[PDB]
Structure formats: structure tokens, C-alpha cells
């Protein structure tokens, strides 16, 4: 999907993701755009794998240096979006790191937590099972 | 449920059946009133006037 125009870089990319998603659901929009990081493409893919948001397209212009991603928001047949308001955990200046012994379960076994423990993005259940802890990236439920 | 002839100056988050029918332009509103009558007419097993014509009565308001 050709952009036909490059988006402008935010102060930080995860906050760009949050702002774009929240203003899309606020303005009744279905498509969101964000920068493309291996971390960020991984987090978007793992959000898709848990039924939170729709198709994602990674757009590379001429190199991995200029890479973005456009993803559609999931919309259930009841017109209710699966995105109940995304939040970031790896906050600049509020970087919260939880060990394997401190991996929580989102609102008592209802939501999904995104944890990059030691090798890549892992959901909450596999992170508990893998006996490996690490960074918690974002909360979507 | 609500059925209304929404206009572009109105809001579409208020009616349970949003239909883009203009009241400033009578060609939509007259047609819709006649067809709403005809729906319950054919529901009551009586002869039906419209809703099968390619172009019904031109009731253009001055």
C-alpha cells in the first residue's frame, strides 16, 4: 500500500501509536498508521494474533531506514471495536520492568499483556510458561 | 425504532433507520412517504399504488 505521503516522526514512536489509535477510535476511523520497528512490528503482530486489531501492512520505501506500518482496527459484527484503548507500559522515563516472578494477569484473566522477555514479544500465558521475564511493552484488553 | 429523513445538516447518530431523504428537495420525501404507506398497504392485503414504478408521481414543491 503506497502512502503517497510520508508521515511525520513523533517525539517517541509508542506514543505516536497510542495517539493515532486513540484519535482513530475517537474520530470513528478504522485505519491507523505508526512507525515500523522490529519491536513495533512485533507488538502489532502479537496484538493481531490476540484478536485486538485487523490487517497490518508494513511499508518500506527504499530501505529498512524509512519503514512505517498501516493497520486496520478490529471491528466486531456488533460494531464494537476490539481496541478498548491501547496503553503503553515501556514509557519514556517510566520504564517499568517486571521479572518472571512479577508477571501479572490482566484484570483477573480477562486481558492480554505484551512481554518481550529475552528473545521477542511473548503473550502473558507463554511468558509465565516460559519461566522467562523481561520488559512489558503495552496493555490492550 | 425511529425512521427519519436525515438531512446533511442533521446528525446520523440519532435515528434507528438513517435514510438520506431531502425535505428541501421534495423528490425524495414524497416518494418515501408514498412507499411507507404502500408497505403497510400491501401488508394489509389491499391494492398498492407505488414502490414498483421506475419513476413515481413528480410531486415537486414550489
Amino acid at each position: 500500500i503506497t502512502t503517497t505521503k510520508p508521515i511525520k516522526a513523533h517525539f517517541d514512536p509508542v506514543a505516536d501509536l497510542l495517539t493515532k489509535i486513540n484519535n482513530a477510535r475517537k474520530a470513528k476511523l478504522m485505519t491507523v498508521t505508526t512507525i515500523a520497528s522490529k519491536l513495533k512490528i512485533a507488538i502489532l503482530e502479537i496484538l493481531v494474533k490476540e484478536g485486538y486489531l485487523a490487517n497490518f501492512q508494513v511499508l518500506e520505501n527504499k530501505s529498512k531506514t524509512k519503514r512505517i506500518v498501516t493497520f486496520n482496527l478490529k471491528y466486531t459484527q456488533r460494531r464494537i471495536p476490539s481496541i478498548n484503548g491501547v496503553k503503553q507500559i515501556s514509557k519514556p522515563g517510566l520504564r517499568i520492568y517486571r521479572p518472571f516472578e512479577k508477571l501479572p494477569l490482566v484484570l483477573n484473566g480477562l486481558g492480554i499483556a505484551i512481554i518481550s522477555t529475552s528473545d521477542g514479544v511473548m503473550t502473558d500465558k507463554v511468558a509465565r510458561l516460559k519461566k522467562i521475564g523481561g520488559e512489558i511493552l503495552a496493555y490492550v484488553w | 425504532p425511529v425512521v427519519a429523513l436525515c438531512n446533511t445538516n442533521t446528525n446520523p447518530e440519532l435515528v434507528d433507520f438513517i435514510i438520506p431523504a431531502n425535505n428541501h428537495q421534495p423528490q425524495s420525501t414524497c416518494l418515501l412517504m408514498n412507499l411507507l404507506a404502500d408497505a403497510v398497504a400491501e401488508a394489509k392485503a389491499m391494492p398498492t399504488m407505488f414502490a414498483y414504478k421506475p419513476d413515481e408521481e413528480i410531486q415537486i414543491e414550489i
Binding site: 500500500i1 503506497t2 512490528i41 503482530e45 493481531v48 485487523a54 490487517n55 497490518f56 501492512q57 508494513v58 511499508l59 518500506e60 486496520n72 478490529k74 471491528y75 466486531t76 459484527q77 460494531r79 | 425504532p1 434507528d16 433507520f17 438513517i18
Partner: peptide, 23 residues
């Protein structure tokens, strides 16, 4: 141009019908 594609998503057509039926 795109690089990935996964999980096609569709929804109902944009005409609200309350309860879908009243028969």
C-alpha cells in the same frame, strides 16, 4: 509498498437496524 498481511476483517453494512426484526 506493503510487506505483510494477516487476519482479514469485515463488518456488517452501514445501515443500522434496531433488533434486526420485529415480526
Amino acid at each position: 509498498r506493503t510487506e505483510k498481511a494477516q487476519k482479514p476483517k469485515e463488518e456488517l453494512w452501514d445501515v443500522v437496524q434496531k433488533m434486526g426484526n420485529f415480526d
